[PDB]
Design a binder for this molecule. Structure first.
Ligand code: GDP
Ligand code: GDP
Ligand code: MG
Ligand code: MG
Lengths: 248, 252
C-alpha cells in the first residue's frame, strides 16, 4: 500500500510547511530541488513530494514537473512486468497533486491557469488556496466561487472529475462548494483548550484542524480517507494507461 | 502644492485598497487595467493636492521589462515639467505631475526577494524615490515579520538598491544618524490596508478587529507620517534637484 502526494505552485505559499503539518497530522528552508519524503507509517507508506517555483521569465516552467511525473510512469511501466516476480509492485507515480493558489483576491494569474491545464491532462489536480488565514470571511467565500468559475470556464478537469450515483451526489458537493480547500498549515504544536493542537501563533491562536478555523481537516480527510483509493484508481486506469498507450 | 505618490508592485497585494486607505485617513475594488492617478484636494495645515497614482500588475507568464511602462510614465512627467518649466504663460506657481514618492509592495513570501522584484526596484530607484513596503503585514507572525524585514534590508543593501532616504544624498553626519535609523531600523514599513470604515479603520479579523492606524497592530501610521508630514518636502526636493535634473541633463 503506497500513496504519493505532490505539492505544486508559487514559491512562498506554505507548500513546504503543509507537507510537514500533513505528516504530523496522520502521525523550514526553501525548496530548491524536487525531493520526496515518505513516512512508513499510517499499513500505508505516504510519501509527499515537495517542489519550488516565480522568475523574470517563466516559459515552460511546468516541464520540469511534467518530466518527473512522466518519469514515474515510465518507471512503473518498466516495473509493471513482474520480472523479479514480486507479490506487490512498488508504485512511485503521483496519484494526487495539490496546486497552491495565491489568495490574490483577483482573477487567477494566467500562469496558474496554464500550469494547471497542462498537469490536469497528466495528473489528478486538487486546487488549494494557500494561507487562507489571510482572507476575511466574505473574501474567502467569493474567492472560492471565483476560482471554481475560472477553472470550469477554462476547461480544467480536476479531481474529482465529472466524467469518471451516491458518489455523484458527493462529487458535486466536493466539486460544487467545498473546493478549493482553503488551508492553514502550521508545523508548531501549542496546547490549546487543554490539549496539544497544531496551529499558527498569530498574535490575535488559529487551529489548523478546527473545522471552524479552516478547511485543512476537510482536505486531509478527503485525500487520505474518502478519496484515497479513487485517486489511485483514476491514476492507474486513466492517466497511466494513456501514457503507455501513447508510448506504445 | 502638488504631492504625487505612486503605488507599485505585483497584483493582488493590496495596493489599491491602500490607496483608498491613505486618502480615507489623511482626510469591492476591481483589478486595475490602466494607470490612473487620483487627485483629492485635501489639507501641512494649509491646503495640499496629493494625487495617488495607481499601477496595474507587474504576475504574468513572461515578465520582461515589465517596468518599462512605468518608467515611460515617470519620464513622461519629466518631459512635461521640462516643457512647462519655462513660464511662457508666466504662471506664479507651476503645476507638478512628477512622481515624488514611489512605494513598492513586497509579497511577504518569507523568503529571499524574487529576482524580478529586485530588477523592478533597481531601475526605478535611478529615476525616482523608492520606499520599500511589505504588503499584508497581518499575514505574518511577530517572529516572521522581524526576520523578513531584516532579510529585505540585507538583500537591498547587497544588491546596491538606493532607496529613499538614499545613502548617497545625505551629507551631514547628523543627517546620516537619523537616516541610518530610518532605512536600517524602520524600513520597510509593514502595513495593513483597510477601506471599509468600521469608527476606527482596520481589518475585520475573526479573532478580533485589527486597527490599521494602531502602532501596536501595524506600521501604517508610521508610513503615513513619514510620507505625509516629516519627509514630504525632502522627497519633493530630491525629486526636483536630483532625479528631474539628471533627466533634464541627459535630455540636453
Ligand atoms: N498566513 C499564513 N502564512 C503561512 C501559512 N503557512 C506558512 N506560512 C508562512 O509562509 C511562508 C512560506 O514558507 P513555506 O512553508 O516554505 O512555503 P513555500 O513557499 O511553498 O516553500 C513560511 O515562512 C510561513 O511562515 C498559513 O497557513 N498562513
Ligand atoms: N491580509 C490582508 N489582506 C488585504 C490587505 N489589504 C487588502 N487585502 C485584501 O487583498 C486583496 C487585494 O486587493 P487590492 O486592494 O486591489 O490590491 P491590488 O491587487 O494591489 O490592487 C483585497 O481583496 C483585500 O481584501 C491587508 O493589509 N492584509
Ligand atoms: Mg518550499
Ligand atoms: Mg490594483
Amino acid at each position: 500500500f503506497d500513496f504519493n502526494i505532490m505539492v505544486v505552485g508559487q514559491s512562498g505559499l506554505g507548500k513546504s510547511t503543509l507537507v510537514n503539518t500533513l505528516f504530523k497530522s496522520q502521525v523550514i528552508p526553501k525548496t530548491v530541488e524536487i525531493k520526496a519524503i515518505g513516512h512508513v507509517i499510517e499499513k500505508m507508506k505516504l510519501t509527499v513530494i515537495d517542489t519550488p517555483g516565480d522568475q523574470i521569465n517563466n516559459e515552460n516552467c511546468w516541464e520540469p514537473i511534467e518530466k518527473y511525473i512522466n518519469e514515474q510512469y515510465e518507471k512503473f511501466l518498466k516495473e509493471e512486468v513482474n520480472i523479479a516476480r514480486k507479490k506487490r509492485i512498488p508504485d512511485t507515480r503521483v496519484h494526487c497533486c495539490l496546486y497552491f493558489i495565491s489568495p490574490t483576491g483577483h482573477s487567477l494569474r494566467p500562469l496558474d491557469l496554464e500550469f494547471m491545464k497542462h498537469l490536469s491532462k497528466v495528473v489528478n489536480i486538487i486546487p488549494v488556496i494557500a494561507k487562507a488565514d489571510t482572507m476575511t470571511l466574505e473574501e474567502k467565500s467569493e474567492f472560492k466561487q471565483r476560482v471554481r468559475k475560472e477553472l470550469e470556464v477554462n476547461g480544467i478537469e480536476f479531481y474529482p472529475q465529472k466524467e469518471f450515483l451516491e458518489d455523484k451526489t458527493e462529487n458535486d458537493k466536493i466539486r460544487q462548494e467545498s473546493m478549493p480547500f482553503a488551508v492553514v498549515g502550521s508545523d508548531k504544536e501549542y496546547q490549546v483548550n487543554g490539549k496539544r493542537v497544531l496551529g499558527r501563533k498569530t498574535p490575535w491562536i488559529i487551529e489548523v484542524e478546527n473545522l471552524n478555523h479552516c478547511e485543512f481537516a476537510l482536505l486531509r480527510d478527503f485525500v487520505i480517507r474518502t478519496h484515497l483509493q479513487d485517486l489511485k484508481e483514476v491514476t492507474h486506469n486513466i492517466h497511466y494507461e494513456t501514457y503507455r498507450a501513447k508510448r506504445l
